[PDB]
């Protein structure tokens, strides 16, 4: 079976792929990430990410949470600095119910006053579980340091903002960003006319965002942890540009993450380069982030306190060698075999598949099948792979780090 793909006059994409699978599935990818949050309404998407299960017009916060659990589905909300998915699942015998629950979330949220009040202090837990995993305030400060206006808005909500969010400060948001011109009622395990029915009957309804003006800057977090974390990046390019596909392969050239469980990561140029001289624990890998307007590229650090500089000055020097022409072709064609795999393996699962069918539909307007991508990986140039790192090295630098920072250098000391 093949993938339908359409478009209404309202600009509302649809998709459908009746794989004759038992487990239906739906996604509604939307552009409402943290970037469209201005200075006043910070952290609102964090709240709105929890605002599922709340009251609607078509049903209550109670009926939703029980009707779903009866049929046995889900209601998950993946969200990014760009996008805001309202994914679900179910058995295909009972889609017509769960669809009705969904669009009442988006098309008719009441966002009553008091249900919010119970829902705010949940954030102090949500925000807290993440930062047990220390990456997600290292990585946030990058966007806070590097970019300025839109993409610097963390997914998560600042502390002081909690206790103070307004419901009007959602209605204004929903009526300005859940708009049929920039949505995508994706489907799966389900037929196409069914979705074409519902969208025209409920989603047949009617702001913008500024661009990520890169700056170049550094933020520091002396927070007493026993280890160090650090990231060092430079201006990447957005997706769709073939300049992207040179980075995304240059990722695996340089540091990919472990492909072998408990492996020495031999083929990684960077991790191998650290392994000489260093004789203590560490780990390190590439960081590629490619948003619609812009992106970032660099690497991410894990080391002890004293050995931050002695590790970062392996990465920076190494990538210079990758920019000074010192490179081979089989590394690339080996690296492509990784990139050509992770794309396919990511879309192995229906969910990871579903993450890609629509993420294209919002920035782009057409579904690129896997084959057409693998050509774009084959048509890559070893003068783009280089540049690439030339853009990184010569480019302005943004940086952040967390842990003990008594021996961690700035940019300029590199």
């Amino acid at each position: 079976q093949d993938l339908e793909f359409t478009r209404l006059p309202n600009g509302l994409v649809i998709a459908s792929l009746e794989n004759y699978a038992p487990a239906s599935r739906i996604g509604l990818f939307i552009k409402a990430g943290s970037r469209y949050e201005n200075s006043n309404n910070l952290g609102t998407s964090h709240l709105l990410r929890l605002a599922s299960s709340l009251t609607t017009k078509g049903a209550s916060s109670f009926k939703i949470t029980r009707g779903i659990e009866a049929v046995g589905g889900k209601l998950s909300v993946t969200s990014t600095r760009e996008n805001m998915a309202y994914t679900v699942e179910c058995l295909r015998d009972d889609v017509d119910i769960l669809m009705e629950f969904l669009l009442n979330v988006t098309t008719a949220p009441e966002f009553r006053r008091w249900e919010v009040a119970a829902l705010q202090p949940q954030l102090r837990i949500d925000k807290a579980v993440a930062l047990q995993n220390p990456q997600a305030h290292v990585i946030e400060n990058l966007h806070a340091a590097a970019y300025r206006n839109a993409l610097a808005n963390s997914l998560y909500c600042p502390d002081y903002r909690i206790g103070k969010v307004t419901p009007v400060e959602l209605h204004d948001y929903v009526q300005n960003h859940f708009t049929s011109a920039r949505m995508a009622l994706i489907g799966l395990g389900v037929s196409h006319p069914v979705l074409k029915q519902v969208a025209e009957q409920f989603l047949n309804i009617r702001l913008s965002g500024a661009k990520a003006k890169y700056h170049g800057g550094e933020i520091r977090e002396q927070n007493g942890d026993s280890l160090v974390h650090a990231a060092l990046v430079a201006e990447s390019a957005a997706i769709g540009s073939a300049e992207a596909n040179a980075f995304s392969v240059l990722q695996h050239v340089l540091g990919a993450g472990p492909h072998v469980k408990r492996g020495s990561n031999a083929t990684s140029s960077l991790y191998q380069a650290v392994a000489k001289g260093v004789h203590e624990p560490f780990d390190v890998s590439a960081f590629n982030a490619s948003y619609s307007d812009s992106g970032l590229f660099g690497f991410y650090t894990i080391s002890q306190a004293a050995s931050a500089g002695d590790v970062i000055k392996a990465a920076y020097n190494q990538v210079k060698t990758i920019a000074q022409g010192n490179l081979s072709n089989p590394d690339v064609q080996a690296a492509k075999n990784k990139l050509k795999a992770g794309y396919l393996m990511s879309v192995e699962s229906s969910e990871g598949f579903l993450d890609e069918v629509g993420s294209q539909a919002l920035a782009a307007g057409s579904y690129t099948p896997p084959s057409t991508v693998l050509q774009q990986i084959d048509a890559v140039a070893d003068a783009d792979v280089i540049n690439a790192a030339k853009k990184f090295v010569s480019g302005r630098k943004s940086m952040a780090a967390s842990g003990n920072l008594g021996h961690t250098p700035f940019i300029d000391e590199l």
């Binding site: 779903i68 889900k74 209601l75 998950s76 909300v77 949500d126 997914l155 982030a289």
Partner: peptide, 17 residues
């Protein structure tokens, strides 16, 4: 890695990367 949030009604809240 390009970290992404996820909460739910029944899936454990998580941090994709």
């Amino acid at each position: 890695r390009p970290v992404v949030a996820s909460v739910s009604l029944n899936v454990p809240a998580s941090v994709r990367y």
